[PDB]
Amino acid sequence: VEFQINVDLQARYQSVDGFGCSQAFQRAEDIFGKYGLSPKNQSYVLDLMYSEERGAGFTILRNGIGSSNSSTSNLMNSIEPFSPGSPSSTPNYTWDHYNSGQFPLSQQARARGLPYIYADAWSAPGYMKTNQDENWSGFLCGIEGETCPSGDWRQAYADYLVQYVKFYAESGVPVTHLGFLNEPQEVVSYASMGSNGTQAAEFVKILGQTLEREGIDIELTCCDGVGWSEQEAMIPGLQVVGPDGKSAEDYLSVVTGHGYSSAPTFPLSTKRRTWLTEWTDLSGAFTPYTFFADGGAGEGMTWANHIQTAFVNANVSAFIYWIGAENSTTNSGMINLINDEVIPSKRFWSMASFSKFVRPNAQRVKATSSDASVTVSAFENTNGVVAIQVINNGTSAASLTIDLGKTHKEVKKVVPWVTSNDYDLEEMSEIDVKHNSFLASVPARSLTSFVTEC
């Protein structure tokens, strides 16, 4: 045996909620033909993203709760664009059955089986904030240390987020996960809003209490920090048990962070599930076809490794890329649209390799490799399908011996699915398994998903 891979289904780790992307800042409109995409390719892109059989079967869609009072440039417009005059005044809410294209997108994703919709606000509306502006950070009026002459807007913001979730549910598209901050560290020209851990915790408790009063069942998140270390720094604040004997962590279902300022390479110190909720290559490079060339930020293998590391080393339950599909020739999205043209990147195919076979409620299980040139991850689905991801970073093909150890069902067949410079997500011939062990060659510089049958 040249390379030994051992999988142990009796050594079990975190659950998986899934994989996906956002179509925020009007990028959902691109999929529906804003820049000339044909009806054929609109349907094709939705199948690539959300069909388990025809595509990646993404299971999480992250939508923006818009803060803007218009839909100019790439703004996401708000359900409450204009101040009601005071926090206690009756709000005027507008529902356009659109949400910058994210509503019809959510309908199309759900039609193809998508279970999880994560609605996240980048900012409260400007009139609820210290700077009276959705932009350039600022704080929710009434949060600890941040008073405003117009009064305390904390309950108004909670009621606003509840009303967004209600419009979605009433329109047949329930939201499963809810967040109220994005990158609270960042002071930027676009929708942004500040909070440290204790300021975030204060609002988590108000929002959780509001949802419980309304009888709405939804998973709360915090805080989409700009990097993994930056999110870790907020967790002590979320864990402070207040006078009432509750922490923010008691109300939270998921702790969320981004990969930009620091990558998900270590476990966060929360007792909750964690999600990597945004990450991409923002360099402005264009790397659609490269799985491996020289370790560029946009290469397929870079992203296969980011995903594998997030699950094995950072203990995440989900991985959400930034934009799925957009009219651009950069690496910001997984799928480049060029008017009526669809170019799925190797970053897309790396995501697809995981997402297609690691279905919601899968559990990560122990998987080891005898050699640092081959890195491995493994998950058992609730239907018993085992999906093993192998990255071969050798310059030659690697002959693997893969032992599945002790299992309930004797495994009889396994199917390899390959992603490389030569292959997108290519199904290879089934391999016969004997005594829960099999041999497989994997190409140089490749990702292979080995998927067990029945």
Ligand X SMILES: *[C@@H]1O[C@H](CO)[C@@H](O[C@@H]2O[C@H](CO)[C@@H](O[C@@H]3O[C@H](CO[C@H]4O[C@H](CO)[C@@H](O)[C@H](O)[C@@H]4O)[C@@H](O)[C@H](O[C@H]4O[C@H](CO)[C@@H](O)[C@H](O)[C@@H]4O)[C@@H]3O)[C@H](O)[C@H]2NC(C)=O)[C@H](O)[C@H]1NC(C)=O
Ligand Y SMILES: *[C@@H]1O[C@H](CO)[C@@H](O[C@@H]2O[C@H](CO)[C@@H](O[C@@H]3O[C@H](CO[C@H]4O[C@H](CO)[C@@H](O)[C@H](O)[C@@H]4O)[C@@H](O)[C@H](O)[C@@H]3O)[C@H](O)[C@H]2NC(C)=O)[C@H](O)[C@H]1NC(C)=O
Ligand Z SMILES: *[C@@H]1O[C@H](CO)[C@@H](O[C@@H]2O[C@H](CO)[C@@H](O)[C@H](O)[C@H]2NC(C)=O)[C@H](O)[C@H]1NC(C)=O
Ligand U SMILES: *[C@@H]1O[C@H](CO)[C@@H](O)[C@H](O)[C@H]1NC(C)=O
Interaction site with ligand X (CB under 6 A)? 294-297, 301, 305, 393
**Contact map string, positions 31 to 60, toward ligand Y, x by CB under 6 A:** -------x-xx-------------------
Q: Minimum distance from CB of 108 to ligand Y (Å)?
A: 17
For residue 82, the partner it binds in ligand U, ligand Z, ligand Y, none, with Cβ less than 5 to 8 A by kind, is ligand Z
Nearer to ligand U, 36 or 295 (CB): 36
Return the number of the residue (147 or 396) whose C-beta is nearest ligand Z.
147
At 139, the amino acid letter reads: F
Is the Cα dihedral 80, 81, 85, 86 positive or negative?
positive
Q: How many CB atoms are located within 10 Å of the residue 43 CB? A: 15
Out of 342, 385, 415, 444, the only residue in the binding site for ligand Y (CB under 6 A) is: 342
DSSP E strands, 271-327:
273-278, 318-327
Distance set, CA 452 to CA 24, 413, 415 (Å): 36, 6, 6
Q: Does 422 bind ligand Y (CB under 6 A)?
A: no
- Does 135 bind ligand Z (CB under 6 A)? Our answer is yes
Amino acid at 232: E
CA distance 318 to 65: 20
Cross-strand bridge partners of residue 8: 366
Q: Interface with ligand U by CB under 6 A: which residues?
A: 35-36, 327-329, 338-339
**Site stretch for ligand Y (CB under 6 A), options 14-22, 52-60, 334-342, 362-370:** 334-342
Measured from the CB atom, is 127 or 417 closer to ligand Z?
Answer: 127
Q: Which entry of ligand X, ligand Z, ligand U, none binds 91, CB below 5 to 8 A by partner kind?
A: none
Q: Find the shortest distance in angstroms from Cβ 232 to ligand X.
A: 20
SS3 111: helix
Give the shortest CB-395-to-ligand X separation in angstroms. 7
- 156-167 per-residue burial string, b: 16 or more CB within 10 A, e: under 16: bbbbbbbebbbb
Beta 398-403 vs 446-452: how paired, if at all? unpaired
Q: Is 360 in the site for ligand Z (CB under 6 A)?
A: no
* Rounded Cα gap, residues 335 and 287, in angstroms: 11
Q: Which of residues 112-131 bind ligand Z (CB under 6 A)?
A: 126-127
Return residues touching ligand Y (CB under 6 A).
38, 40-41, 340-342
